[PDB]
Design a protein around this ligand. Structure first.
Ligand SMILES: C[C@@H](Oc1ccc2ncc3c(c2c1)CCOC3)c1cncc(-c2nc(Cl)c[nH]2)c1
Ligand SMILES: C[C@@H](Oc1ccc2ncc3c(c2c1)CCOC3)c1cncc(-c2nc(Cl)c[nH]2)c1
Ligand SMILES: C[C@@H](Oc1ccc2ncc3c(c2c1)CCOC3)c1cncc(-c2nc(Cl)c[nH]2)c1
Ligand SMILES: C[C@@H](Oc1ccc2ncc3c(c2c1)CCOC3)c1cncc(-c2nc(Cl)c[nH]2)c1
Ligand SMILES: O=c1[nH]cnc2c1ncn2[C@@H]1O[C@H](COP(=O)(O)O)[C@@H](O)[C@H]1O
Ligand SMILES: O=c1[nH]cnc2c1ncn2[C@@H]1O[C@H](COP(=O)(O)O)[C@@H](O)[C@H]1O
Ligand SMILES: O=c1[nH]cnc2c1ncn2[C@@H]1O[C@H](COP(=O)(O)O)[C@@H](O)[C@H]1O
Ligand SMILES: O=c1[nH]cnc2c1ncn2[C@@H]1O[C@H](COP(=O)(O)O)[C@@H](O)[C@H]1O
Lengths: 326, 326, 326, 326
C-alpha cells in the first residue's frame, strides 16, 4: 500500500547527470535555439526571465525580448504599475511580454488591466500549483480571456501536470524547491530534484502535446541544456540574470566590489502570516544582459554540437544522459 | 545465515529524503497539528521538549504546554527537586507535564514522588531501551502505577519496539545515535539512521495501535514533518529549544554574542565509570520559546499544505518521500 | 524507446574505483612498461605528453622520448614553426615524435610540412571527434599519407570509437570532459566519467585489434594504472607535466614560490567566436621531467606488483577493480 | 569473462556502516574482551600495537601486554637491537611479545635471534602478502621454528587468506591501503576498503578455523568494534597509539602545543629504490597508554552492550550492520 511505497521513489538533480556526446553533423554556431511554447508564443532562444522583484520589470523584458527570449513582470507592486510595465515593452517594437498573477481577490482586476495593456501570456505564479485554489483560478482565466496564453505552476509531478493541463493551462511551470534562493526544502521538507521533476512532468506533457517550463536551480549554461534535454521546452532564470544592469535592483558597492541584491519572492523583504520560504542575498554585478545571454547560449550551442542536436525537439526527444556519483 | 546477512540492511537519514508535493485542498494556516499519544494524553502541536539538563525544567514545560506541547523534566537532579518541578507546571493552569526516570535503585522512590505531584506521563529515559533491566522496569512501573501513561526508550528496531509494547509501554521512544550532541556512532560504532529507525518502529507500532516518539536529529522544521511523515506521532527536540530563554541554562556572552550552553546527558558535565557518549557545546540565544515554535510549526503547516495533509494521521499514512544523493 | 532510456546509463570516474591486489610473481622493479600502439610506434613507458601550448614543444618531446615516452607538438603556432619543432626531436638521436592537426583549411598544408620534417604520428586534435568534419578528415589523412600513424579524437563511446577506426584511425583518443583544466562539463553539460569512457571505448577497440589513448583526468600515478587497467594502452598527461622545466611555459615567482602557467587549449588565452571550454591557471614548478616520470612510473610499477601484472596486456585484460563510495 | 567482471565488485569502509542495536542481557562493564588468536597466544583485550618505528619498541609492548594486549617490535633497526627489545618485555613479568620480519637475506638470522630472546609470535610484515617471496618465507619459518606462532600479511582477499593459511600461517593480517598514513591508494591505485577486506578474509578464515588481524584505518573506538564485528579477531592500531608517551618517538613542542611524530613504514624517513607509499606527519601527545586504552575499550564495551555481544565470538558471528550514505 501507501505505507510500503513511502521510500520507493529515487530522484536526480543537475549535478547527478551529464549528457552523452553523440554523432554530430551540425556546428554549434548553426544549431536552432527556437521553441514554440503555444500557438501564439514562439521564442528565438529557450530562455525566460523570472517573475521576481530583483529580476524582471520592463527593462529586463525589453532586453530579453530583443535577444530572442521573454520576461515575466512580477506581481509584487501596484495593479496600476504592473499594467504600465506591459505597455512599455509593447511600445518598444511590438515585443513578446508576460506577467504574473496570484489566486487572491486582486487577481480578477489585475488580469484585466494586463490584457488591456497588450500582454501575450498570463502566469499563475504560485508556490504550490497542485492546490484547489489554483485549479479553479486556471479554469476562470481561460474562461474569461481564452485568447491569452496561460502558464500555470509551480508543480513537480505528472499528476499535478495532468490536472493543470485539464483545468485550462497551455504551459505548465516545473519547479518545487530547486531555486538557488529557495529554502522550501529546509523549511517545509518538500521538494523534487529538478532533473526528475522536469522528466516526470514532460512525460505527462507529451500525452497532451503541451509545453513545460523548467523553472529554477540553473547555475550555468550546462544546466540549461540538461534541463531542456530532460524534457523542458524553455528555461526560467532568476539568479543568472539578477546581476545584469537590466534587473530592477539598484547597483551598490562593498569593499570596492559591485553587487546587485537578489532575493526570493517568499523572503521577508518581498512579502512586505506566512513563514519565510526564501532568503535575501547579494550577487556580483554582471553588466549587460546581452553578454550574459551570449555566454549562456554559447554553452547550449556547444552542448547541442556535442549531442548532435540540430534543434530543441531532437535534444528533448533523443539526447541521452549518464548518471555519476559526487 | 547471520554471517551472510551482516551487510544486507540499508538505512536513510533526514538529508537523504524529501516529501513529494501532492493534491491540496487545505491551506497551511488551517491544517490540524493535534495528536493523541495515549488515552489520557493529547497535544495541540506534535512537539515534546527533551528530558535534558540544558533543555527542560518547569519553565520549559510551562511554555511548551502553553503553546500546545509537552515538556519532560530531566532526572539529573535531586529526587525532591524533580517532584517540586512537576507541582509548578500543574499550579500554572493544570497543564500536561512529563518526567524522566532510570532503571537504578533510586527509580522506585523517584516514580512515587513524581506521580504524587500530579505528573501525567513517566519516561524511562535510557541509552539502550532493548536491555533486560529496562524490560523489567517497564513491567514494574505499569504494575505499580497503571493510571500513569508510560513512555519507554530509546530503541531503533521493530523487535525492540515490539518487546517494550509487550512489556507495558504505551509510547515507544525512537532514536539510537541521531542526536546533534550524540557521539554514540563514533564511540560505540552503533546507530540506525533516524528516518529508517522511525519507519521500522512505526511499522511495528501500527500492529499494536500504539504511539512512537521520533527522538533526535531534527535540525529544522523540515526535519519535523519528515520525522512525522516517516511514522512518528510526535517529535522530541533538544538542540532547537536549548537556545530559548525558557531553558535552564544561564545566558552568557562571548565576543559581544549571546550564547546558551547545550550538552548531552552522556557528556562528562552531565554525568557529574561510563565512557562519555555525548559532548558539551554552546548554542546561540534564540529568545522566547513562542517565537521558535511559531517558526517551526509554520514550516510544518507549510509542508502539510504541500503534501495535502489535513492532519498528522494523513501525513503518517499517505505522504510519499523521494530519495536523492548528496 | 529513447525517452525511456534517457537516464539508464551509470558511469565511473577514477575516485570511484581501486585495483584489487592479486597473486604476484614479479617485483615492481622488473615489470614490463612497454606498449605497441601501432605497427610503427612502440614506447618503453605508456606515457604521452599532451598536445598543449603549456605542455609540449621540442624540449618536452625530446625529454619524453629519452625517458621512453612520446610528445605531441601543439598546433597553436605558425605552420613553419611546428615543422621546425619536429626536425629538432629527430636530430636529437632519431627519437619518436608526434604532432597535432585540426579540420580547418590550414590542415592540408600543415600535415605535409610535419611529415616532411620526419614525424612518426599525426594527431587529429578535436574537442568532438564524433563530428562529420573529423570523420572526413580522418579518411583524407590516411588516403594522402598512409605510411604515417594516425591518432584521432576525442571520443567517449563505443559507437564513436567504431566510426573513427572504420574511417581510417590507427589509435582512438578517449576523453570528453575529464581534464583538470576542462570546463566542458560546466559550460556544455556534456561528458562521460573517464573510467567508463576508457572501458566502453576499449570494449570496441578489442573488436578491431586497435589502440586507445586514455586522455585526461589523471592527477597521480594511481590514476595512470587505473586508466591503463580500465583498457587504455597509453596515458596522456597535461597537468602532471606542465610544471616541469621542459614545458614551453616561462618560470615565474609569486610570494617566494616558483610557478609555471598551465591553461586549456579552449581557454581565452590559447584561442588568441567560440565560447571558452577551458580555464587559465598556475601550477607549482616540478623541476626536471626525469624526476616526475620516475615518481609516476614507480607508482605504476608498484601497482603492477600489487595486481601481479607482468606487463600492460595482463593489466588491461585481467586486472579487477572494486567500486566504493566517497 | 575477466573483462566483463572488471567493475562487478562493491566494497565498504568504516564510515559506510553502523552496528544495529540488539537484545541485551549483559552490561558494558561485564562483557568479555578476551580472544584466542592461536593455541599458544591469548589476549585480555583484542588490541595489538603496530610493527612501526613511531609506534612499538619494548616500552609500548610492556604497557600493551600489561593492559591485556600485545606489541609488535618493528624491524627498522639493527638485528642485535631487535633481539635486545624482546628480552626486556620477557624480563618485565613474563609478558606476551611479538616481532616483525621481512623476506630478504637478513630475515633467516633475524628470526633466530628473536626466538632465542623468548618471542611468542613472529610477524612477516610485508606491503603485499600475496607475493611468491612471502609464500615461500611463510613455509620456511614454520619449517624452521614450528613452536612459534606465525602471523603473515598484509592481504585483502579470500584467495590471499587461503594461500597464506595453506603455506603455514597461523594468523592472517588484513589491510591493503586503509592506514591513516598510507598513500598506496594514491600512489599504486590499489586497495580494498577495510570493512569488506576484513569480511572477505574472515569468510575464508572460518573455513580453516584460523585467526585474522584487522589491520589499519581505525580512527576511534567505534571503528574497533566495527572491525571486530566484520570478522576480525583482534585490531592493529598505529595512529591511535603513536601519541602516547610509551611510543619510541621523542616528545616535541610547536606553538605551545605538545606533539609526537608518526610516520608510515614506507615513508622516506623510515626507508633510510622503492617509490614512497607512506607519509611523515605529527600527532598530538596523548599521555599514558593506559588512559588511551581505557577510553577505546570503554567504547567497545559500550557497543557490545548495544549489540548484546557477551563476548567477541558473539560479535563476530551474530552482530548485524546497516549501510548508509555520506
Ligand atoms: C512564503 C512563500 O514562498 C514562496 C514564494 C514564491 C515561490 N515561488 C516559486 C516556488 C516556491 C515559492 C515559495 C516554493 C516551491 O518552489 C517554487 C509562499 C507564498 N505563498 C504560498 C506559500 C505556500 N503554499 C503552500 Cl501549500 C505552502 N506554502 C508560500
Ligand atoms: C554515557 C551515557 O550516554 C547516553 C546518555 C543519554 C542518552 N540518551 C539518549 C540516547 C543515547 C544516550 C547515551 C545514546 C543512543 O541514542 C539515544 C550512557 C548512560 N547510560 C548507559 C549507557 C550505555 N548503555 C549501553 Cl548498553 C551502552 N552505553 C550510556
Ligand atoms: C573552446 C574549445 O574547447 C576545447 C579545446 C580543446 C579541447 N581538447 C580536448 C577536449 C576538449 C576540448 C575543448 C573538450 C572535451 O574533452 C576533450 C573548442 C574548440 N573547438 C571546438 C569546440 C566544440 N566543438 C563542439 Cl561540437 C562543441 N565545442 C570547442
Ligand atoms: C614503500 C613501502 O611501502 C609500504 C611499507 C609498509 C607497509 N605496511 C603495510 C601496508 C602497506 C605498506 C607499504 C601498503 C598496503 O597496506 C598495508 C614498500 C615496501 N616494500 C614493498 C613494497 C611494495 N611491494 C609491492 Cl608488490 C608493491 N610495493 C612497498
Ligand atoms: O522565495 C522563494 N522560495 C522558493 N522558490 C522561489 C522563491 N522565489 C522564487 N522562487 C523560484 O526560484 C526560481 C529562480 O531560480 P534560480 O535561477 O535557481 O534562482 C523562480 O523562477 C521561482 O520559481
Ligand atoms: O549524551 C548523549 N548521547 C547521545 N544521545 C543523547 C545524549 N543526550 C541526549 N541524547 C538524545 O539526543 C536527543 C536530542 O536530540 P537533538 O535535538 O538532535 O539534539 C535527546 O532527546 C536524547 O534522546
Ligand atoms: O580547454 C580545454 N577544454 C577541455 N579539455 C581540454 C582543454 N585543453 C585540453 N584539454 C584536454 O585535457 C587533457 C589534459 O588532461 P589533464 O592531465 O587532466 O590536465 C588534454 O590532453 C586534452 O585532451
Ligand atoms: O607507509 C606505509 N604505507 C601503507 N601502509 C602502512 C605504512 N606503514 C604502515 N602501514 C600500515 O598501516 C597500519 C597503521 O594503521 P592506522 O592505525 O590507520 O594508522 C600499520 O599497522 C600497517 O599495516
Amino acid at each position: 500500500g501507501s505505507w510500503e511505497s513511502k521510500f520507493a521513489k529515487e530522484s536526480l538533480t543537475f549535478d547527478d547527470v551529464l549528457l552523452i556526446p553523440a554523432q554530430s553533423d551540425i556546428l554549434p554556431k548553426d544549431v536552432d535555439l527556437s521553441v514554440q511554447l503555444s500557438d501564439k508564443v514562439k521564442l528565438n532562444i529557450p530562455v525566460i526571465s523570472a517573475g521576481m522583484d530583483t529580476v524582471t520589470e520592463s527593462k529586463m523584458a525589453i532586453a530579453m525580448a530583443r535577444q530572442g527570449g521573454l520576461g515575466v513582470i512580477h506581481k509584487n507592486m501596484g495593479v496600476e504599475e504592473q499594467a504600465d510595465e506591459v505597455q512599455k515593452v509593447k511600445r518598444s517594437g511590438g515585443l513578446l511580454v508576460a506577467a504574473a498573477i496570484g489566486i487572491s481577490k486582486d487577481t480578477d482586476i489585475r488580469a484585466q488591466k494586463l490584457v488591456e495593456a497588450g500582454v501575450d501570456v498570463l502566469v499563475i505564479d504560485t508556490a504550490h500549483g497542485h492546490s484547489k485554489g489554483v485549479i479553479d483560478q486556471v479554469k476562470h482565466i481561460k474562461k474569461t480571456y481564452p485568447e491569452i496564453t496561460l502558464v500555470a505552476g509551480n508543480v513537480a509531478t505528472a499528476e499535478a501536470t495532468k490536472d493543470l493541463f485539464e483545468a485550462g493551462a497551455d504551459i505548465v511551470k516545473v519547479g518545487i524547491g530547486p531555486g538557488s534562493i529557495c529554502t522550501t526544502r529546509v523549511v517545509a521538507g518538500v521538494g523534487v530534484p529538478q532533473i526528475t521533476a522536469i522528466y516526470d512532468c514532460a512525460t505527462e506533457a507529451r500525452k497532451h502535446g503541451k509545453a513545460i517550463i523548467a523553472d529554477g536551480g540553473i547555475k550555468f549554461s550546462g544546466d540549461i541544456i540538461k534541463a531542456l534535454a530532460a524534457g523542458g521546452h524553455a528555461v526560467m532564470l532568476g539568479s543568472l540574470l539578477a546581476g545584469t544592469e537590466e534587473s530592477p535592483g539598484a547597483t551598490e558597492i562593498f569593499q570596492g566590489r559591485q553587487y546587485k541584491v537578489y532575493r526570493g519572492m517568499g523572503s521577508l523583504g518581498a512579502m512586505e502570516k506566512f513563514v519565510p520560504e526564501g532568503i535575501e542575498g547579494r550577487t556580483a554585478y554582471k553588466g549587460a544582459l546581452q553578454d550574459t545571454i551570449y555566454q549562456l547560449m554559447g554553452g547550449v550551442r556547444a552542448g547541442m554540437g556535442y549531442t548532435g542536436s540540430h534543434d530543441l525537439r531532437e535534444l528533448r526527444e533523443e539526447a541521452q544522459f549518464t548518471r555519476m556519483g559526487p
